[PDB]
Ligand binder design. Structure first.
Ligand SMILES: [NH3+][C@H]1CCc2cccc(-c3ccccc3)c2CC1(O)O
Ligand code: NA
Ligand code: NA
Ligand SMILES: [Zn+2]
Length: 891
């Protein structure tokens, strides 16, 4: 083979597009798109043919400077590229015009212009604008847009495109139109249009410094207008945060957010017209689970922060994607951490990175955050680009500190405003701030660029020495990145290591927290006036995206878990104790399986560790959010990073043993806490207020729901009574948990029907119910999936429905990885079926295959057979074919 684009090959276009004037005329069975491109010849032109991207368009006519061009003689069109022969391309400013027909009403791939229920909506990132009209569809082609939309007024009373609405007009035959002018130069991936019978809430915002009045609108279909308020509040918070932290003010008189039901991704930052998966915009406390609130906060914030990091400064080319995505995720993380004031925001992000992203980075799909090549750029909207990218963007803040970070960021945003940029431009701006901080104009960040170009997760390991006579402590540090298919030689990175030192006798800090800068393969950091042997607190806040090998004893880790100040180090110390136990018991079960032993031993869980868990849980003044992290074992996708040829049944046995060891000691504690937390966790303050969320209270419910799961799996005496009462709670997080945990009881199908009836009248709540069933720990899960298919999912093409039914189930370690391969077969069937109408979502459904080469060799073969069968399917999409060829080491 397919067509591969390479980062090194970037060259500017020989053409310029200065203005785009669109007329989009929507009818029931066709949409007519007329477009005039005011174009010119660039200084790079060498007399080449004029080639436009245009995919699946039906040409009515195309013209240059008022004369229609003729197919064969002056142009060719192959359904992908329109080529105008150079002998017919003007040598100076010219107008290119075209009229094409498209069909949003049958566009089930949700790229370009499409119909979502009764809403017409676009999605153009990355390369979708070419599915609407002809363009040089790449992000360095920046232009100004004048867009007119017309439609039946009864069906489509609300018409939106980017920018100021400059005219509204009636049209004979029951139609109407609206015209928009977007004064900000933009690439075409930021174009959007919406038409629908939309309802809204609105507010007026006044910017902090320029005192500009901004009208804020949030839109949904009529049925769900009551679910729009939290999004509007989140938008106001986002605007204030960008003003307060970054000095950045919104730059149009109006900002619209729109929820649609059918959306391939979370949302999209189209200028002045952000469009969202409804599941990331709409919520209400009676019809959404708790996690919806942080999700909406994240996604609204993310899309708002793109207004500068992506829109006002955009991308030279798609290889720079992390420049807007890593940076915008980092901005949203700062925002969400400040808004929630919990440990959950940061720890949740780290947990996702160290599971999903670390898995990706050790898989055949491993790439640097700035990739070197692609076929379908939609396959590179990855956790690597977004989440490792965000950690790389966060490390600049750790290295520079807040003052100089803000200085460097403002250099970047000012210098590149209204223009494209590259990752090097960001590093240059940060380097200017670095020279200031170090008071050294010879200092540079050249080594830092390796975070953009080098793939793989570094491993950072430690050795310690304490001289009690000298009161001198040394931390010897080593870094190593495993060679991979991107680099045979790996180089040392600039790794910032935020550290403290804890006195094990009293739990107190012994030094001012300090950031060590490891730039060599190894280094020794010495500390004087250390009065007693400390326990080091390493990588506070998770200060670099690495595998941490602390070389601490479990006794030392327990002391950090109890007494350290840093939430991440406490949680990581607990994680490391669990991992040591998991690897040991896994090996014991594995040997017993392989050697067909009739009897054998298992290493018990450390009793002092269990005591420490009890100590933390029983502390009435300790944080409920943190507590939920310590009672759960690490995620399977984290564990797999530390085991080769992983047998998933052996791992399931391992985790069950460990959980039962701890529960045998702590179940009475868990039950007492589950009961004692009820009053505050389930208090109804703010239940009618969609402008305020108590994130601490939410973490109390999370803790209760985590404990209830543990007690239910343990068959704690009479816990079904608590489950049934829990099913009567007003909070969906609780009553959906009651379904999950009832899987271990004969009441499961009673609660299945009860909660279905509570969910079925709200589209998003029903999707949450589907996820709850899909992830239920049921021995009959395969028959339950068939029931969902036949009774609820049916023929839906809504990505939220399909993903809800199948993805949670793929994380069922015992069932999805059944040694028959039946789970691999089931999901591959869904992938192949979905690829015939939505290649992006089909490729998303491939997620469970990413770890194929980490499993035992029998499961490797079963997964490879299904992947190779998918690759043989006629008319497989480029998206899915690229993904599977790369994943199977063919590309
Ligand atoms: N520019 C777009 C591209 C699409 C895309 C793809 C994958 C993930 C995400 C996303 C990340 C965090 C929160 C919400 C959505 C997005 C949204 C986006 O805005 O980055
Ligand atoms: Na439907
Ligand atoms: Na639907
Ligand atoms: Zn983004």
């Amino acid at each position: 083979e397919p067509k591969i684009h390479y980062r090194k090959d970037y060259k500017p276009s020989g053409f310029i597009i200065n203005n785009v004037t669109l007329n989009i005329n929507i009818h029931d069975n066709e949409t007519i798109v007329r477009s005039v491109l005011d174009m010119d010849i660039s200084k790079h032109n060498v007399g080449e043919d004029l080639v436009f991207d245009g995919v699946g368009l039906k040409i009515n006519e195309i013209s240059i400077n008022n004369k229609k061009l003729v197919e064969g003689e002056e142009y060719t069109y192959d359904n992908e590229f329109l080529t105008i022969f150079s002998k017919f391309v003007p040598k100076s400013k010219f107008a290119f015009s075209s009229e094409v027909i498209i069909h949003p009403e049958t566009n089930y791939a949700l790229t370009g212009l499409y119909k979502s229920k009764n809403i017409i909506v676009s999605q153009c990132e990355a390369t979708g604008f070419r599915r609407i009209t002809f363009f040089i569809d790449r992000p360095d082609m920046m232009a100004k847009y004048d867009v007119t939309v017309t439609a039946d007024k009864e069906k489509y009373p609300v018409l939106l495109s980017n920018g100021d609405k400059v005219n509204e007009f009636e049209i004979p035959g029951g139609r109407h139109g609206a015209r928009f002018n977007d004064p900000h130069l933009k690439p075409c991936y930021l174009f959007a249009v919406v038409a629908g019978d939309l309802k809204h809430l609105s507010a007026t915002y006044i910017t902090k410094y320029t005192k500009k009045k901004v009208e804020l609108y949030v839109f949904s279909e009529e049925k769900y207008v009551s679910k729009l308020q939290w999004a509007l509040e989140c938008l106001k918070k986002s605007m204030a945060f960008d003003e307060d932290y970054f000095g950045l003010e919104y730059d149009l008189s109006r900002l619209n957010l729109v929820a649609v039901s059918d959306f391939n991704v979370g949302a999209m930052e189209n200028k002045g017209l952000n469009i969202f998966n409804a599941n990331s915009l709409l919520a209400s406390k009676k019809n959404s689970i708790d996690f919806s609130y942080a999700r909406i906060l994240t996604v609204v914030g993310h899309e708002y922060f793109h207004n500068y990091t992506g829109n006002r400064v955009t991308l030279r080319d798609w290889f720079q994607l992390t420049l807007k995505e890593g940076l915008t995720v980092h901005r949203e993380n700062l925002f969400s951490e400040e808004m929630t004031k919990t440990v959950t925001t940061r720890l949740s992000h780290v947990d996702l990175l160290r599971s999903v992203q670390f898995l990706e980075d050790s898989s055949p799909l491993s790439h640097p955050i700035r990739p070197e090549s692609y076929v379908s750029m939609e396959n590179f909207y990855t956790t690597t680009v977004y989440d490792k990218g965000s950690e790389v963007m966060r490390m600049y803040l750790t290295i520079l500190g807040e003052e100089y970070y803000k200085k460097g960021f403002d250099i970047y945003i000012k210098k590149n405003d209204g223009n494209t940029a590259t990752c090097e431009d960001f590093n240059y701006a940060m380097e200017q701030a670095y020279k200031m901080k170090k008071a050294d104009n010879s200092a540079n960040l050249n080594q830092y660029l390796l975070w953009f170009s080098q793939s793989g997760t570094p491993h950072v390991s430690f050795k310690y020495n304490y001289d009690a006579e000298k009161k001198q402590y040394s931390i010897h540090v080593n870094q190593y990145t495993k060679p991979d298919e991107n680099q045979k030689e790996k180089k040392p990175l600039f790794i910032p290591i935020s550290v403290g030192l804890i006195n094990p006798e009293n739990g107190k800090e012994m030094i001012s927290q300090t950031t060590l800068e490891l730039t060599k393969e190894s280094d020794t950091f010495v500390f004087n006036n250390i009065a007693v042997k400390p326990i080091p607190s390493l990588f506070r806040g998770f200060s670099a995206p690495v595998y941490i090998e602390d070389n601490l004893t479990d006794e030392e880790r327990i002391l950090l878990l109890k007494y350290d100040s840093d939430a991440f180090v406490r949680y990581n110390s607990c994680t490391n104790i669990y991992m040591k136990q998991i690897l040991m018991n896994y090996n014991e079960f594995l040997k017993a399986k392989n050697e067909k032993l009739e009897s054998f031993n298992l290493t018990p869980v450390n009793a002092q560790f269990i005591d420490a868990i009890k100590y933390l849980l029983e502390d009435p003044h300790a944080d409920a959010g943190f507590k939920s992290y310590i009672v759960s074992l690490p995620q399977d996708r984290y564990i797999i990073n530390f085991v080769s040829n992983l047998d998933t049944d052996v791992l399931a046995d391992t985790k069950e043993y460990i959980y039962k060891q701890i529960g045998d000691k702590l179940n009475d504690v868990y039950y007492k806490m589950f009961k004692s937390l009820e009053a505050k966790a389930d208090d109804l303050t703010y239940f009618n207020d969609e402008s305020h969320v108590d994130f601490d209270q939410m973490n109390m419910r999370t803790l209760r729901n985590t404990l209830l799961s543990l007690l239910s799996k343990a068959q704690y005496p009479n816990i079904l009574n608590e489950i049934i009462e829990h099913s009567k709670s007003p909070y969906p997080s609780n009553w959906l948990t009651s379904l999950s945990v009832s899987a271990y009881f004969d009441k499961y199908f009673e609660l299945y029907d009860k909660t279905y009836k509570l969910s079925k009248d709200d589209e998003l709540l029903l999707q949450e119910w589907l996820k709850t069933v899909s992830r239920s720990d049921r021995k009959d899960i395969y028959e339950i999936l068939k029931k969902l298919e036949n009774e609820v999912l049916k023929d839906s093409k809504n990505p939220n429905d399909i993903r809800a039914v199948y993805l949670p189930f793929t994380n069922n370690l015992r069932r999805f990885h059944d040694i028959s391969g039946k789970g691999y077969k089931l999901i591959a069937e869904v992938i192949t079926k979905t690829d015939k109408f939505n290649p992006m979502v089909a490729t998303q459904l491939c997620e469970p295959f990413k770890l194929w080469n980490k499993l035992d060799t029998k499961r490797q073969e079963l997964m490879l057979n299904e992947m190779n069968t998918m690759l043989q399917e006629p008319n497989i999409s480029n998206n899915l074919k690229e993904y599977l060829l790369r994943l199977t080491n063919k590309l």
